[PDB]
Design a protein around this ligand. Structure first.
Ligand SMILES: [Br-]
Ligand SMILES: [Br-]
Ligand SMILES: [Br-]
Ligand SMILES: [Br-]
Lengths: 443, 441
């Protein structure tokens, strides 16, 4: 095959111009979509918080519409999915991953409006869910949409445009170009066989998407942590320790979300009315907690700069972490449209800060700042649950801009991946696709 | 489909043996990378110290700077021709090939050949990088332990050879990410599925980087500081720059290939004509590293000076052309040393040059030429060797200007784009093709 290789090596990196151009329009759309989604979630959340002012006196009545408003929006999201596109429930990343292995269909005519509006209700209701779920799945579906609309033929174009959709989808969710592209080549793409996914094209999609996001969200960081301190070579060993901790907790978390999917499936047994109702309950709880204990609800981005600064108590970091574990499970495993990605950053951040605290008082000769251990742990639950640390590490580096912590971030992350593996853990996404893929045959 | 379901449930379960052994590779590659890096400086120091004791008589030190770098050069071209011809030039294509199971990994030979051989050319002050030596050595290091510990399997044979190369590029730049990204964007088998463990590659890259940090910390190779930001209405300029890189990329790619031939004529294949030729190129690199050091040496030293807009337009043009010349002579003559680094220095100067024009053409953008330098720094790496992702993440890891991430991606993309629409090719793969086609013919 030596001669084939010589022919191949010279024909390397020659992507069809049509695919490059089509990647450019996919990105532009996925961007504007993700922007519009984000803008939408904000508006609804704004009106909700605007209602708690109209009834800011009668405290019970306050605690009433705080519940109802998030309930109505949740049900409307639980409904849109259970009725028109069941594949739009949950994250949506396993489903796109499935579409890459050619085992799940990309019914963009149904998912695009369902994921967009359904998620807009759940997210806009202030449920503990991310924007990644929608944006990624929506993005990939945009990639398929232009594929059928322009009728491009080829496995390259199908796999590529599907990938640059998800990539550009993740990019606009976090203003993180590199994280999006890296997500495709480390976790998204088929993991057991060769593939014709033009990386250069995935790049062009992300670029146009991120640019679109930059047109509308200028001069405000999703997370402004500020330039923290550094990490000495004799401090590193504390990060490997934090990693191990994440490493045994990852799989445990994985079992809970999987198990909670089952436990919550009983409550409705597949019935659309029981499910929708249960949705409004979970959503309403989040809207309630959104007023009385905001750190237990919401996406989680808000409490990240705070924890990293050490402005929470050790008691709070235990409160927030426990309660958020409970609410994250409730919102995601219930099948509501919305990613688990972002809330897992919060869990990691909180747990990291918790470690950093104890680490500070135990060893003042190190001159530690508990914020360094939070940033390290930020992308650590993305290493022991999702098992895509290279994505997490780069992502966190894109959102926090503290490169001088690249070693602890890596080391901790790898502490999580190695111990997740050894303790009997499996990637959260693939472990869900397999669940979905087995069920499809089980019946 | 059921095949997939089973595969999913078993995903990311790298054998502990492949893991534990990756940790030792990176260590050995790290320590070696450090020792290599030290020796090169030590030898540069001597030539610096020798120029002192013969300070007067300008024609005398023009001679001793020649000779010292002429002698060291010959010693390098010799240790390769006589003991490991495969350990000439870069070495990355060779490891790329070895990953395809299409080239041999003679670590018992290549390791001490590349090491001391590199020391002659690197420490001679020739326009070469530490990548080639480090990456290649690293792979051979990783191969050594595969042999030494007799690990059996394609996965094991592929992983350990990869992490070694990864942990070697890293320790040559203190860039842990770009090391891991080099393997999965360029180094690994580009046309068939392979069993390389990402997780395991990581472990190797760390341990190496850790070793490097033990011996080199607190001092960065390239310091630029925090440059200004990049307005959205200014972004198009980074596309124009990338386009310029995109058309020059292949043109340079031709010359680095063509000059290989034109130098192979000079010595025909003879070890004596070659070594003696290599000592002329090397001797020139020690000489030029005194009358205009910005035309010789690795090139890392002029980058911050370039970024800060300290040069003038003329001195930029001079340095560029001069370095275009001196780079080919060092690499296309098969001297042990990568071309990765001297392209960074080429891209930086070219970028600055473009930036210099931008500042005066558009004062309303309030531009700083340094931003274009950063954008264009890893643009040759994108338009020639065609690894923009690894290139960008590298530059980011060495300049810490994430605020310029959009211009850096735009430029690097417009380079990888226009290089394809002009018939350019992955230079590292264009070399392996050459070597693989000269073999079966
Ligand atoms: Br899901
Ligand atoms: Br998600
Ligand atoms: Br070479
Ligand atoms: Br090179």
């Amino acid at each position: 095959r030596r001669r084939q290789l010589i022919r191949q090596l010279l024909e390397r990196d020659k992507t069809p111009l049509a695919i490059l151009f089509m990647a450019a329009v996919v990105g532009t759309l996925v961007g504007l979509a993700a922007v519009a989604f984000d803008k939408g979630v904000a508006w609804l959340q704004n009106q909700r918080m605007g209602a708690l002012v109209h009834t800011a006196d009668n405290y019970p009545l306050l605690l009433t519409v705080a519940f109802l408003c998030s309930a109505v929006l949740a049900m409307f999201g639980y409904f849109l999915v259970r009725k028109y596109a069941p594949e739009a429930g949950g994250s949506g990343i396993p489903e796109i991953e499935g579409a890459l292995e050619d085992q799940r269909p990309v019914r963009w005519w149904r998912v695009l409006p369902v994921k967009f509006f359904g998620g807009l209700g759940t997210l806009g209701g202030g449920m503990v869910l991310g924007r990644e779920g929608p944006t990624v799945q929506i993005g990939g579906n945009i990639g398929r949409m232009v594929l059928d609309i322009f009728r491009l033929k080829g496995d390259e174009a199908r796999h590529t445009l599907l990938a640059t959709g998800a990539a550009a989808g993740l990019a606009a969710a976090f203003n993180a170009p590199l994280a999006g592209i890296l997500f495709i080549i480390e976790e998204m793409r088929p993991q057991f066989r060769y593939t014709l996914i033009s990386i250069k094209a995935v790049f062009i999609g992300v670029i146009m998407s991120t640019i679109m996001y930059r047109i509308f969200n200028h001069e405000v960081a999703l997370i402004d942590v500020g330039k923290l301190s550094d990490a000495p070579l004799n401090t590193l060993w504390l990060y490997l320790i934090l990693g191990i901790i994440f490493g045994i907790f990852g799989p445990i978390f994985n079992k809970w979300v999987l198990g909670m999917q089952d436990l919550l499936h009983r409550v409705h047994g597949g019935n659309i009315t029981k499910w929708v109702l249960m949705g409004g309950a979970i959503g309403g709880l989040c809207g309630l907690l959104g007023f009385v204990a905001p750190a237990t609800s919401g996406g989680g981005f808000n409490l990240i700069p705070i924890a990293t600064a050490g402005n929470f108590s050790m008691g709070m970091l235990v409160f927030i972490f426990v309660a958020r574990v409970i609410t994250t499970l409730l919102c995601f495993s219930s099948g509501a449209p919305g990613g688990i990605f972002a809330p897992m950053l919060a869990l990691g951040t909180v747990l990291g800060t918790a470690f950093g605290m104890v680490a500070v008082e135990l060893f003042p000769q190190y001159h530690l700042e508990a914020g360094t251990f939070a940033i390290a742990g930020m992308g650590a639950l993305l290493a022991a649950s999702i098992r895509a640390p290279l994505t997490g590490i780069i992502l966190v580096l894109e959102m926090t801009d503290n490169y001088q912590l690249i070693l602890p971030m890596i080391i901790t992350g790898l502490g999580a991946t190695l111990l997740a593996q050894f303790t009997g853990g499996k990637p959260l996404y693939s472990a869900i696709l397999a669940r979905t893929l087995a069920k499809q045959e089980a019946e």
